Amino acid sequence: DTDDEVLALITQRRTADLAEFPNPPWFDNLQTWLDTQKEDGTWEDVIYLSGCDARRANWPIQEHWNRLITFASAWSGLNPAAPSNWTQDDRLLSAVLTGMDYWFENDYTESDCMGQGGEDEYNCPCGTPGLWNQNWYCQAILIPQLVSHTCLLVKDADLSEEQLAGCERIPGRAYDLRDGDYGHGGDLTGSNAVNVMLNSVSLALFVNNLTILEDAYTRVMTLMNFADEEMEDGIHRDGSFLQHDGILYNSNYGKDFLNAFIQLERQALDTEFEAGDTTKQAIAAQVRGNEWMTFIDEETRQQYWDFNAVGRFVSHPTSDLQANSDINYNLTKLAAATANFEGDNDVSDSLRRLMSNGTEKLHGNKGYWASDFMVHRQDEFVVTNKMLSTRSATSEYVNTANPYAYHFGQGTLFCYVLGNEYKDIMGAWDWNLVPGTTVLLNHPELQSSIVKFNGKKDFVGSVSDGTVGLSVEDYVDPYDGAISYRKAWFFAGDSVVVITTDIQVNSSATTADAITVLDNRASADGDIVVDGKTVDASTETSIEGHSLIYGGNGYLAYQTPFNLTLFEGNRTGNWSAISTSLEGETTVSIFSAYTTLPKDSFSYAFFPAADNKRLDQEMKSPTSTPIVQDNITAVLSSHGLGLVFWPGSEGANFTIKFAELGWGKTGSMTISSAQPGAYLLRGYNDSAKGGVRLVATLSDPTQKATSAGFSLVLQGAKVENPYGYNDTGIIVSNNTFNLEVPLPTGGMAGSSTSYEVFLRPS
């Protein structure tokens, strides 16, 4: 056996791995499924419709292969959940062989049944004999996958020549068409190509062909490399997985990519097929990006995906076991696949925090530039925010699922303190009140035809330094332009300052009120509190106030008070009217609050996981101060200074005294930028050197500028370079510090970069 030892090792590993396909509950029906099998291999209670009579989606004939794979898993003795007395039992082997015979004998013969099946223009019209389906997916992926599993599980049994012919024919017909046309499928890309190559890996291990294995592994590892174009589907360098033109989708498509990588990497360890360096870098990036999208159910310890990375599955309940039901990948197998990861690729800490089941939480602030996404986490809450630019989309209406998701991705603000705030409330949900979004009330009329849209502006990004974050969104309504504004979020500590400026409402199209939705969650224990007064919102009630407290979260209004519209109680919706689900109707208790906005601008602050004492201290001593001024938005807080130069602010100035920041008793600072951009200014008081250590963070939201023009003008202070390097475009004089730096390009367009200087009170 020359060099087939690598093939045999990979075969052993994959055969032990493919034995895990059957659900552990399926092993109970071994005796029943064996006894109720007919003499021709079929079963009575299984639907064997083929051709133009079968069900296009979820072909019921696959139950046959499910039972065959269960038999084979029990027979091989590789699945630990199977009773040991069925190991090497000839009854299961004979049953599997008879089922394989039944399927192979009724295999179709016209190649046009692969994809264009049922089309009269091609050579497989309705009535052509054979086991095929009008759905191209059945002949390309599904049936080949099941066949590959069954054949690989019984590779060592004495198989007839017809059985081997079928085991090589059924997946080979799809593998031979890899660089060709699949009829309705056309060119297979991404998930379909990965599934085809995975089934081809199974086939190559069956027929003992190393060339097919080389080709399939090369193709798969190439498909999982970095995507560096705007909206380009794939793993980006920020850690986000895009699909369907900028729709964040780390929870479904990227999930399948990561599962395929886990499988292939664990199976091909220590061979000439283990992933290279580029693939491991991309996999580490995706693993880290997934961890920041994962929150915990504090009661059940089950981990989920954030509702901004789920897309159309938000309209499905968790019982349907879709992308929104779980993370849906084995953390132990992911740890085993990424053990050999070294250097900057090491993701051992991510896996440690994931498998800890909430005992180690993720602490910091992260900003995704390629998807306009930002996450702020403590050990006490998880806050997410997706924005809408020319490089992302809202949602999508696919396969009758998700028709009222127009407002998603248009400036959402989700909060996870318990882990069940938004669990399966989408049934009775009011889809016009998406938490965080600033929309016109019940505009437009939500329906299936109005769902997916791309942003119209480019100045939508985020700046962060790992601890504090500032996201910006030059927003315009994409469906009709009935509402436009500029909104920013400042993430620092347990507080989120939200400054909505430059509110525009096209009153010719509609006259609805411009509102900002604070939250739309499930009922939590406690009472609604407005200015310290309990409010009964069993019926939809309006009220004004400066503070709102419910479910452990606080909402503080600056200057102009709120104009709230509150509701708490049962709503009713139909799961089968928003998706293909069969759950029917649902009745859940929902608390929903949204304020009516003033005409020009409105600012407020959000304090998750806070109590009355924190909010009282804050209202009596605000640690933050929103500042709106001449196309510039600024946030003065104890943790630093957020600063937004919106488009049209070339040559403006923002002047702030050192005493307002807490740096020095005297002295001011005049800030000016050459081109629009987002900036962070954090100061640290140094008593030893007698001065202030300033850290300046910057980025480009448009992802189209190559250089920056940061300029500071100090009064009563002196700038001193600590490292003494002008290598970063730093111009240090007596009292002036200009920063001309090259911005990141390619896949890093829109990422942040920080620099240091030292100030001395003159």
Ligand X SMILES: *[C@@H]1O[C@H](CO)[C@@H](O)[C@H](O)[C@H]1NC(C)=O
Q: Which is nearer to ligand X, 32 or 638 (CB)?
A: 32
Owner of token pair 């964040």: 248
- Stretch touching ligand X by CB under 6 A, among 7-15, 205-213, 455-463, 587-595: 205-213
Stretch that binds ligand X, among 204-212, 346-354, 400-408, 649-657 (CB under 6 A): 204-212
CB of 89 to ligand X, least distance (A): 8
Contacts 24+ apart (CB under 8 A), 442-445: 442/512, 443/482, 443/510, 443/512, 444/406, 444/479, 444/480, 444/482, 444/510
Q: Smallest gap, in angstroms, from Cβ of residue 528 to ligand X?
A: 38
Backbone torsions φ then ψ of 61, nearest 5 degrees: -65, -15
CB of 86 to ligand X, least distance (A): 6
The CB-of-208 to ligand X minimum distance in angstroms stands at 7
Task: Select 213 or 401, whichever has its Cβ closest to ligand X.
Answer: 213
Nearer to ligand X, 83 or 276 (CB): 83
> In angstroms, what is the minimal distance from the CB of 211 to ligand X?
4
CB of 178 to ligand X, least distance (A): 10
Of the two residues 29 and 189, which places its CB atom closer to ligand X in the complex?
Answer: 29
**Crossing angle of the two packed helices 161-175 and 90-105, in degrees rounded to 10:** 60
| Chain centroid offset of residue 200 CA | 28
Give CA–CA dist 27/618, Å, rounded.
59
- Contact status, residue 419 vs residue 524, Cβ threshold 8 Å: no
Q: How far is the CB of 327 from ligand X (least distance, A)?
A: 8
Nearest residue (CB) to ligand X, 209 versus 735: 209
Site for ligand X in 719-758 (CB under 6 A): none
Total number of residues binding ligand X (CB under 6 A)? 12
Q: List 382's β-bridge partners, or say none.
A: 377, 416
Helices (H), 182-318: 191-207, 210-223, 253-267, 277-291
DSSP code for 158: -
SS3 at position 5: helix
Q: Which stretch binds ligand X (CB under 6 A): 190-198, 258-266, 330-338, 510-518?
A: 330-338
In angstroms, how far is CA 300 from the centroid of its own chain?
22
Residue 52 burial by Cβ neighbours in a 10 Å radius (0-12, 13-18, 19+)? middle
> Which alpha helices (DSSP H) does 630-721 contain, by range?
658-661
| Of 81 and 577, CB closest to ligand X | 81
Nearer to ligand X, 98 or 209 (CB): 209
At 402 the three-state DSSP class reads coil
Q: Does 621 bind ligand X (CB under 6 A)?
A: no
Q: Which of 641, 664, 665 lies closest to 654, judged by CA?
A: 641
Query: Which among 717, 752, 750 has a CA at the least distance from the CA of 735?
Result: 717
Tell me the CA end-to-end span of the chain in Å, nearest whole number: 81
362 scored as a contact of ligand X (CB under 6 A)? no
- DSSP string for residues in 709-749: -EEEEEESEEEE-SS---TTSEEE-SSEEEE--BPP-GGGT
Q: Which of 152/417 has CB closer to ligand X?
A: 152
Q: How far apart are CA 411 and CA 388, in angstroms?
A: 7
| CA 418/CA 247 separation, integer angstroms | 26
User: In the range 207-246, which residues lie near ligand X by CB under 6 A?
Assistant: 209, 211-212
Per-residue binding letters, 5-24, with ligand X (x by CB under 6 A) = ---------------x----
Taking CB under 6 A as the binding criterion, the range among 79-87, 560-568, 636-644, 697-705 that sits at the site for ligand X is 79-87
Instruction: Tell me the C-alpha to C-alpha distance, in Å, between residue 316 and each of 230, 259, 411.
Output: 29, 22, 22
d(CA 141, CA 197): 9
- Stretch in the footprint of ligand X (CB under 6 A) among 83-91, 242-250, 615-623, 703-711: 83-91
Of the listed pieces 131-139, 274-282, 328-336, 688-696, which binds ligand X according to CB under 6 A? 328-336
Site for ligand X in 23-62 (CB under 6 A): 30-31
DSSP 85: G
Q: Name which of 83 and 584 has its Cβ closer to ligand X.
A: 83
Least distance from ligand X to the Cβ atom of residue 411, Å: 34
Segment near ligand X (CB under 6 A); pick from 103-111, 206-214, 488-496, 499-507: 206-214
Candidates 329-337, 546-554, 661-669, 722-730: pick the segment binding ligand X (CB under 6 A): 329-337
Give the three-class secondary structure for 491: strand
469-476 and 533-535: which strand pairing?
Answer: unpaired
Query: Given candidates 60, 83, 584, 648, which one binds ligand X under the rule CB under 6 A?
Result: 83
To the nearest whole angstrom, how small is the minimum distance from the Cβ of residue 95 to ligand X? 13
Among 156, 158, 332, 534, binds ligand X (CB under 6 A): 332
Question: What span, in angstroms and rounded, lies between the C-alpha atoms of 294 and 628?
Answer: 34
Closer Cβ to ligand X, 209 or 560, answer by number: 209
CA 498/CA 444 separation, integer angstroms: 24
Block residue for tokens 């097929």 = 273
- Whether the ω angle into residue 403 lies within 30 degrees of 0, i.e. cis, is no
Binding segment toward ligand X, per CB under 6 A, in 81-89, 228-236, 490-498, 632-640? 81-89
Alpha-carbon span 65 to 197, nearest angstrom: 20
Task: Closer to ligand X by CB, 93 or 509: give it.
Answer: 93
330 binds ligand X (CB under 6 A): yes
Question: Which of 1, 39, 45, 85: binder of ligand X (CB under 6 A)?
Answer: 85
Nearest to ligand X of 177, 514 (CB atom): 177
Q: Is residue 331 a contact point for ligand X (CB under 6 A)?
A: yes
Question: Closer CB to ligand X, residue 64 or residue 266?
Answer: 266
The nearest distance, CB 385 to ligand X, in angstroms, is 28
Residues 670-709, mask of contacts with ligand X (x by CB under 6 A):
----------------------------------------
Are 695 and 682 in contact by the 8 Å Cβ rule? The answer is: yes
Burial degree of 68 (CB within 10 A; 0-12, 13-18, 19+):
buried
Does 287 help bind ligand X (rule: CB under 6 A)? no
Judged by CB under 6 A, the stretch of 80-88, 141-149, 595-603, 657-665 that binds ligand X is: 80-88
Q: Which residues bind ligand X (CB under 6 A)?
A: 20, 30-31, 83, 85-86, 209, 211-212, 330-332
